[PDB]
Design a binder for this molecule. Structure first.
Ligand SMILES: CCN1C(=O)c2cccc3c(S(=O)(=O)NC4CCCCCC4)ccc1c23
Length: 130
């Protein structure tokens, strides 16, 4: 190529083999209710898989975004009991939304989509059990 096209990292890790299986009510609720609701939102699809910098023509994406995150990764982390607590899961959602804000211009369509998803997410985490 005569113009830079970018390249993609391996996707984020989704399992911690050394970590003990510690199931919790909040993590179960995050997987079964919060993530499922977010996944089905009309604006979710761009956030469901890792950014393909090459296919999306975002050649500098991984120059700018040092800690990629997407909902498919979060889903797998929940499934694999990767998180010790709800706060770690919530931090990954936050990384995903803030990545979008970092990379893109405040007025961009993708940013509107992220903001709508983030607003729903923040509502849903008020539901977490004790
Ligand atoms: C959430 C990951 N992500 C981006 O940060 C981003 C920037 C620009 C386009 C784009 C796309 S895209 O599929 O190339 N463009 C979508 C942009 C949002 C408007 C409606 C759907 C098209 C998907 C995921 C993205 C981006």
């Amino acid at each position: 190529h005569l113009v830079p096209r970018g390249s993609n990292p391996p996707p984020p890790e989704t399992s911690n083999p050394n970590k003990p299986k510690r199931q919790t009510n909040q993590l179960q609720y995050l997987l079964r209710v919060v993530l499922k609701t977010l996944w089905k939102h009309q604006f979710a699809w761009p956030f469901q898989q890792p950014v393909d910098a090459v296919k999306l023509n975002l050649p500098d994406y991984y120059k700018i975004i040092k800690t990629p995150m997407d909902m498919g990764t979060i889903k797998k982390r929940l499934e694999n009991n990767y998180y010790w607590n709800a706060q770690e899961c919530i931090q990954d959602f936050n990384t995903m939304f803030t990545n979008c804000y970092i990379y893109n211009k405040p007025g961009d369509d993708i940013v509107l989509m992220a903001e709508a998803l983030e607003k729903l997410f923040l509502q849903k985490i008020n539901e977490l059990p004790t």
